[PDB]
Each structure stands twice: as C-alpha cells, then as structure tokens.
Amino acid sequence: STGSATTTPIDSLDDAYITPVQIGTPAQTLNLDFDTGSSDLWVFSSETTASEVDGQTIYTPSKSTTAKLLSGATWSISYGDGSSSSGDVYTDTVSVGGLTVTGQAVESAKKVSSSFTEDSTIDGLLGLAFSTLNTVSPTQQKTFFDNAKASLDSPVFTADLGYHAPGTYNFGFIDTTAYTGSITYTAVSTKQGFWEWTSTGYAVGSGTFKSTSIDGIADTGTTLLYLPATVVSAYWAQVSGAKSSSSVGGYVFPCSATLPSFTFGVGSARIVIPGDYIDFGPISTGSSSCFGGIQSSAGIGINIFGDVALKAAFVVFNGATTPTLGFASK
Ligand SMILES: Nc1ccc(F)cn1
Numbered sequence: 001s002t003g004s005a006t007t008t009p010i011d012s013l014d015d016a017y018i019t020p021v022q023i024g025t026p027a028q029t030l031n032l033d034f035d036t037g038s039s040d041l042w043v044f045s046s047e048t049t050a051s052e053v054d055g056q057t058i059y060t061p062s063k064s065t066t067a068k069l070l071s072g073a074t075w076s077i078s079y080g081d082g083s084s085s086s087g088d089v090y091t092d093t094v095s096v097g098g099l100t101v102t103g104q105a106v107e108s109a110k111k112v113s114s115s116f117t118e119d120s121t122i123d124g125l126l127g128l129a130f131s132t133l134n135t136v137s138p139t140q141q142k143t144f145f146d147n148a149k150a151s152l153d154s155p156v157f158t159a160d161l162g163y164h165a166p167g168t169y170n171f172g173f174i175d176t177t178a179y180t181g182s183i184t185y186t187a188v189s190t191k192q193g194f195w196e197w198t199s200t201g202y203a204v205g206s207g208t209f210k211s212t213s214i215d216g217i218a219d220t221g222t223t224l225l226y227l228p229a230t231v232v233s234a235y236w237a238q239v240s241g242a243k244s245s246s247s248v249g250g251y252v253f254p255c256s257a258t259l260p261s262f263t264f265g266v267g268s269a270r271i272v273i274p275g276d277y278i279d280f281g282p283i284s285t286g287s288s289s290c291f292g293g294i295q296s297s298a299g300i301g302i303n304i305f306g307d308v309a310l311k312a313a314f315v316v317f318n319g320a321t322t323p324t325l326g327f328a329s330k
Contacts, residue, residue: 001151002172003099007034007161010121013281014307015223017161018121019169022095023106024064030057030123034169035221036159036195036317039133039143040077041094042085042107043124052112055120061108067092075107075135080222080300083115089136094144099171101148105141128157128220128317133193145171145319155319159220160330161311163277179314179328184269188323195317197325200267204235205260216303218315218325226297226304235262235294248283251292255282262294264309266327273312
C-alpha cells in the first residue's frame with residue numbers, strides 16, 4: 001500500500017506545514033503538523049480545556065464508532081520552543097491520503113500551552129521521529145509510520161515541502177518526477193530517537209565550500225535552520241546591517257537586503273537553499289528589521305535541519321532495517 005497527502009504552509013512565512021488526516025469512523029478530518037522531530041500523534045479534542053481552544057478543529061472520541069480508550073494511558077510532551085501538551089489516549093483508525101492504520105494511538109489533549117491555542121490552523125501533531133521518543137505511559141505507543149511500515153510498498157516516507165506553495169508527504173513510495181538528479185543517501189543514528197545525520201559542510205552564497213562535519217536532525221517540525229555559531233556567524237557576516245539581537249532573540253537583518261543562498265553538503269552532493277527562503281519578515285508588525293531563517297544552535301544542544309533546509313530538497317526518510325536519509329535537489 002501507499003499514501004499521498006498535500007502539505008500546506010500555515011501562513012505567508014511558512015511558519016509550519018499542515019496536512020489533512022482522517023481520524024475515526026465516520027472520518028473526522030484534522031489538519032496536523034507532520035513532525036519528524038517528535039513521536040506523538042496528538043490532537044485538539046472534545047476534552048481540551050475550553051479556554052485553550054481557539055479556532056481549531058477537534059476530535060470527539062465519543063462520536064467515533066472505532067474509538068477505544070486505552071486504559072490508564074496518559075501522555076505529556078514538551079517541545080524545544082517551550083510549548084507543551086498532555087492528556088489521555090485512544091486507539092482509532094487513522095488515514096493519510098488513502099493509507100489506513102487501524103488501532104493507531106491518537107493522543108487526545110486535555111491541556112495545551114498558549115502557543116498551540118494561538119495557532120488556530122494547527123489541530124495537532126503527527127510524530128514521524130522513532131517510536132522510542134513516544135511519551136505514552138505506562139505503555140509506550142508506536143508512530144503512524146511504524147504501524148503502516150510493514151504494509152507499505154517500500155518502508156519509506158518522503159517530505160516535499162514547498163516555499164510559499166503546496167507540497168506533498170508520500171508514504172510507501174518514491175516519486176521519481178518530484179526531484180532532479182539523484183537521491184544521495186546518508187547514514188542515520190537513531191540513538192537520540194531522531195533522524196540524525198552528518199552534513200559534510202556548507203557554503204555561503206557563491207563562496208568556497210567548507211568541509212566540516214555538522215551533526216544535526218532532519219526536522220519538519222522545526223521552522224528554521226539551527227547551525228553552529230561559527231557557521232551562522234559566517235553566513236550573517238555576508239549581509240550588510242545584520243546583527244545578533246538579544247532582545248529579538250536571534251540574528252536580524254535590514255528588510256531591504258537580498259539574502260545570499262546557503263548550501264549544505266549531503267556526502268558529495270549539495271543542497272542550495274535560496275536566499276529568499278531565509279527571510280522571516282519583520283521582527284514586529286511594521287518594523288523595517290527582519291528576522292533571519294538561519295539561527296545559532298548554541299542554546300539548543302543539537303543542530304536542526306528544519307523546514308528552511310528541508311523545503312529546498314526532496315527528502316527520503318528510509319525506514320529500511322538500517323534507517324537512512326536521502327536528499328535530492330528539486
Ligand atoms: N520544534 C518544535 C516546536 C513545537 C512543536 F510542536 C514541534 N516541534
């Protein structure tokens with residue numbers, strides 16, 4: 001079997017991507033954030049605290065004839081941005097663009113933090129990192145991909161995010177028309193539960209490529225590209241007026257600038273992120289200072305190849321016996 005669904009940016013800045021997901025019987029369609037950096041499938045629901053719901057589509061487990069409460073199971077998650085959610089667990093039928101999984105753990109939110117409430121376009125998350133990170137207690141649950149894997153035509157899922165445009169999440173197959181050239185595969189470490197790989201280096205604009213090992217994760221759930229301070233300083237040193245701002249919380253640059261591109265290595269291959277992909281608009285409404293899309297990972301603990309980097313490529317999340325990541329230009 002295979003699945004194919006369109007993913008859409010939530011706003012004009014591509015702050016996150018939403019993909020329609022069918023839950024329960026009859027189908028309850030929720031727009032979820034497909035996150036290769038986490039492993040919980042959680043949704044806004046009829047159980048979420050009323051004041052914490054503001055525009056989101058909710059899942060009502062009582063209206064699903066196939067919903068079953070997982071006895072004594074609870075979940076609680078906290079993300080890198082300081083946001084969090086928690087609640088109880090159901091098992092139900094979940095479908096992504098024609099691909100179905102029965103008995104998928106659907107984590108129903110009783111509480112969500114302010115950032116989830118403030119974003120009415122995101123109805124929940126669909127975790128695509130390794131199941132070892134799933135927070136369901138006392139019995140850990142598997143991801144949608146893990147549950148579907150055996151049934152797929154090929155044990156893979158692909159991410160094809162758009163810049164200011166619609167994109168695609170495919171499951172069980174590789175669309176050979178969605179990229180140019182060849183897919184270069186790279187080694188993956190699953191020891192931290194992430195699609196963690198090593199980039200072979202970088203280049204700023206038309207500058208010389210720097211061979212250096214950058215250990216990071218392929219994360220669709222993170223908006224920006226987080227890299228070592230040395231690398232981010234080299235990039236922003238090419239933009240006149242750019243500076244690191246402690247009040248704004250990162251590198252800012254004059255909105256009138258034309259940003260240079262950023263290249264990252266995948267083995268002998270190169271992925272070029274156009275400069276426009278790194279512009280995250282005014283720091284505050286009406287400001288002439290803009291926020292940068294390439295930020296330092298010094299306070300994180302890990303490098304994050306987020307949406308900024310991934311949307312410049314066709315990305316294969318290969319769940320074969322030994323998982324690997326594939327990257328191609330497009
Ligand atoms: N880096 C993040 C932040 C929030 C979230 F829901 C997922 N990932």
